[PDB]
Symmetry: C2
Subunit: 314 residues, 2 copies
């Protein structure tokens, strides 16, 4: 069975962590044709290290690879070092620019170590931020879609105060989020999605009974998106819509509106997609596991699940 | 098996709806002893009507009943009339005063018709409002607790604009919600509950990084509640806490924060408790169904679920 149906970048994450190890284990399990669609970004020295340990030298010749985040000393498995911090970011940066320029259609980043990156003197608050930075966009022009338990929920606003979010909300900002998320939905394998838009206020303002924000922001936005020919219901109260479970994409106005459903229903098997200008970036859903780095204990199931998700066919 | 363990008031709701019908069908299914703990508030004429329809004449003699919301004309099944609007409110008012005075320990209200009540010239924004009015409390001293799928979530604010909610939130208002909800928890059968408080902002402001509201409102409130000797964690991000599933009561800051989890996990089978003073009032979770009124085809499962919930053993 074939899980990779398009070109992808795989940044291998922290080269001292389990990222290199799981990168090889996942490519191992793909077919020859599948492997040629995955360009691996990271220091060759780290993939060599992981290949001797897991005894997968044969595979290195098949890998399509671009050097990024080279190290100036041998790989020290399990060790938190500024070097590996920088490697991680350079690798992820190489992968993202490859997506921007159109060489690949999406990016998967293997695990990072926050401390390592901070010790290099590099600001890192998460992939939403990094992606924005790298592409020259403001952080609010990149949207986060959570995916788990059949739910896809893009968020118009994210890591800010509720009040700050309400002040930023506009018809345009909603439109941008949905456009970004419908594009992302084609890649995920749902070309013509059914879309639901959450209300800002309870019961979507109930007309204007509970505030004017929905009549100013979400109602105008839904009518513009229909006129361009999208299938869009709402605004509706977030509680009531989610319960019906009959849409392929939900559009949350605030962080909590979209994160509560997801963390309740998909406590483990859930993906975070950061979406910019052509660029869909997902993490694997786990840490770098420095204490088992190079010990042959980590499997690639999380990485393979992520590849299946970003590599579905239209 | 016995579901009623204490004295309860059952206001029969709109006498032209299915309220009378479901009241009888639910009492039917209880044992003789259970029936004597439920005092039925409403116009006798409407219970007579529903007794012929559902063919339960035998039952009327066993009912403990207080006349309330008497009608001045025959019962008209299916019809929206100011009179039935007034009946509903009088019945529910009789039931609530019975709770206030200590004759019963909680109240269940069968379905009303909003239009009917409005056409009588009666202000009605829900049971929170009615209960406050009847008890001589301000509307913001009555809180709504949703209960479904093992989750209990009180809400500090409810049917208002998000902005209006943020402006109303204070340490005191949180404290009041929790005290009302802990009292309610004793009645529900959890005397000494473990409590979780949601953050106003994502990640509970993450200190003060994502807004100052949590440091001003929820953090001071939690410290006061501990010092009086309650078991209270938070504020935490709503998503993250709910996922742990290790508390008996969650404290939501906004409507949507508490209604999304509930309607997703218990999309039909959730109860709405209005709590004020010692008075816990619950609706059945459905409408008055005027199109089947009188046809004897209404299901009492929602009412029985509500009775089981408020008629809790410990
Ligand atoms: Zn978050
Ligand atoms: Zn509601």
């Amino acid at each position: 069975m074939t899980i990779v149906h398009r070109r992808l970048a795989l940044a291998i994450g922290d080269p001292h962590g389990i990222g290199p190890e799981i990168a090889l284990k996942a490519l191992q399990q793909l077919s020859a044709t599948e492997r040629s669609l995955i360009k691996v970004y990271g220091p060759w020295s780290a993939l060599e290290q992981a290949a001797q340990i897991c005894q997968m030298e044969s595979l290195l010749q098949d890998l399509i690879h671009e050097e990024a985040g080279s190290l100036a000393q041998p790989v020290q498995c399990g060790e938190i070092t500024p070097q590996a911090g920088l490697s991680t970011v350079q690798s992820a940066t190489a992968a993202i620019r490859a997506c921007e320029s159109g060489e690949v259609d999406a990016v998967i980043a293997c695990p990072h170590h926050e401390t390592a990156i901070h010790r290099a003197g590099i600001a890192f608050s998460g992939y939403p931020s990094l992606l924005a930075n790298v592409l020259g966009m403001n952080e609010d022009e990149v949207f986060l879609m959570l995916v788990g338990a059949g739910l896809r929920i893009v968020h118009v606003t994210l890591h800010e105060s509720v009040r700050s979010a309400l002040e930023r909300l506009s018809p345009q900002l909603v439109i941008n989020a949905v456009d970004a998320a419908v594009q992302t939905c084609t890649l995920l394998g749902v070309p013509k999605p059914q879309v639901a838009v959450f209300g800002i206020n309870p019961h979507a303002s109930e007309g204007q009974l509970f505030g004017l924000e929905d009549s100013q922001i979400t109602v105008p936005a839904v009518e513009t998106l229909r006129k361009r020919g999208l299938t869009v219901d709402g605004p509706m109260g977030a509680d009531m819509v989610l319960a019906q479970r009959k849409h392929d994409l939900y559009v949350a106005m605030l962080h909590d509106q979209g994160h509560i459903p997801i963390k309740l229903l998909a406590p483990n098997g859930a993906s975070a997609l950061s979406i910019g200008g052509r660029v869909v970036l997902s993490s694997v859903g786990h840490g770098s596991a420095m204490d088992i780095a190079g010990r042959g204990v980590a499997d690639a199931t999380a990485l393979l699940r992520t590849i299946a998700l970003l590599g579905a066919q239209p």
